[PDB]
Design a protein around this ligand. Sequence first.
Ligand code: L29
Ligand code: CA
Ligand code: CA
Ligand code: CA
Ligand code: CA
Ligand code: CA
Ligand code: CA
Ligand code: ZN
Ligand code: ZN
Ligand code: ZN
Ligand code: ZN
Lengths: 159, 159
Amino acid sequence: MGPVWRKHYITYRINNYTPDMNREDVDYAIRKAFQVWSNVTPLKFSKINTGMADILVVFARGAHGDDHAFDGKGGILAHAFGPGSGIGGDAHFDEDEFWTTHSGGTNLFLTAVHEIGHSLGLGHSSDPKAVMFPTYKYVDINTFRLSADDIRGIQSLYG
Amino acid sequence: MGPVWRKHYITYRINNYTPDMNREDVDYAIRKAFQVWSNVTPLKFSKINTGMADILVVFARGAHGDDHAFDGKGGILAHAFGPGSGIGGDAHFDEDEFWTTHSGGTNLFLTAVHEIGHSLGLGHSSDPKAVMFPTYKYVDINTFRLSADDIRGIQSLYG
Ligand SMILES: CC(C)[C@H](C(=O)NO)N(CCNC(=O)c1cccc(C(=O)NCCN([C@@H](C(=O)NO)C(C)C)S(=O)(=O)c2ccc(-c3ccccc3)cc2)c1)S(=O)(=O)c1ccc(-c2ccccc2)cc1
Ligand SMILES: [Ca+2]
Ligand SMILES: [Ca+2]
Ligand SMILES: [Ca+2]
Ligand SMILES: [Ca+2]
Ligand SMILES: [Ca+2]
Ligand SMILES: [Ca+2]
Ligand SMILES: [Zn+2]
Ligand SMILES: [Zn+2]
Ligand SMILES: [Zn+2]
Ligand SMILES: [Zn+2]
């Protein structure tokens, strides 16, 4: 393995909101995305509105302060840093994308699941069924499930 | 090092056409895509309409006889085999994608530039500026350029 979180209780904070969606929708998509991963691991995720969280969720465009500039609409959608102090664990979403509760844009839920995988220490999967496979494909949020390879990946890091 | 073409006169043939575009907008996009690479290499590319070619261009959907099935709309866009006989060099475009002369779909020209890169022996690039960076972004065909990295890579396979 590379790095992992050495604790099981992990906090996140939503730094700022995208204007593409309602604030309630953004909270919900993010909360469900963490739930995908807490469902298959010992990890507990807790939303914090003050103080400093382990995992900061940020919407930004272009050069946004971290040597990995976003690229305007399309292309790179998002990135996240592996477990660590400071910017480690943080997930950044390209505001030049159009974020959506369902399809017809870039689905925030699905992307957040992918990115949180990174935040927890996963790399990319060679398996096209896996959410950690590095191409975006819309699947209905209600029918989305982690693949065998996703779970095997995360359980090897956290039991 | 991976295989390369041993000869300099390389042929391609378009096996079938996507209905998403005029037959001739497809020829144009493909021809321009080859031109991108012949401009920076000794290689020359000729289209043939019958007989055996070096690079067969295919539009297929799902499983189509090569162990790398496509995945329906979205996700994977296309794939191509490195130099060699038989399947070698062939370039397969996912028919479930919606192919376009511009945007409002997946641009055939830009995607063909990427796949031909594979047909000529190139792997992916970690440089986002590179066309061999494995992420699609639309850019007007007039403004598109190979990056220093792409050119460096191809000029280090061919002479
Ligand atoms: C820059 C990174 C950090 C970033 C990301 O990871 N953030 O977490 N991107 C991913 C960029 N790609 C990679 O890092 C990477 C690394 C190694 C291998 C690959 C790879 O093979 N990707 C697929 C390439 N495909 C094919 C291909 O290479 N054909 O030649 C085949 C062989 C599978 S592809 O069909 O998707 C394809 C991709 C791009 C082009 C292309 C490129 C330039 C011009 C025209 C077309 C053509 C085909 C990708 S990212 O694009 O922001 C990204 C991608 C997906 C998701 C995601 C996934 C599941 C659910 C929701 C969202 C989130 C973000
Ligand atoms: Ca982008
Ligand atoms: Ca952090
Ligand atoms: Ca936006
Ligand atoms: Ca061939
Ligand atoms: Ca596809
Ligand atoms: Ca199609
Ligand atoms: Zn960032
Ligand atoms: Zn990723
Ligand atoms: Zn194929
Ligand atoms: Zn590729």
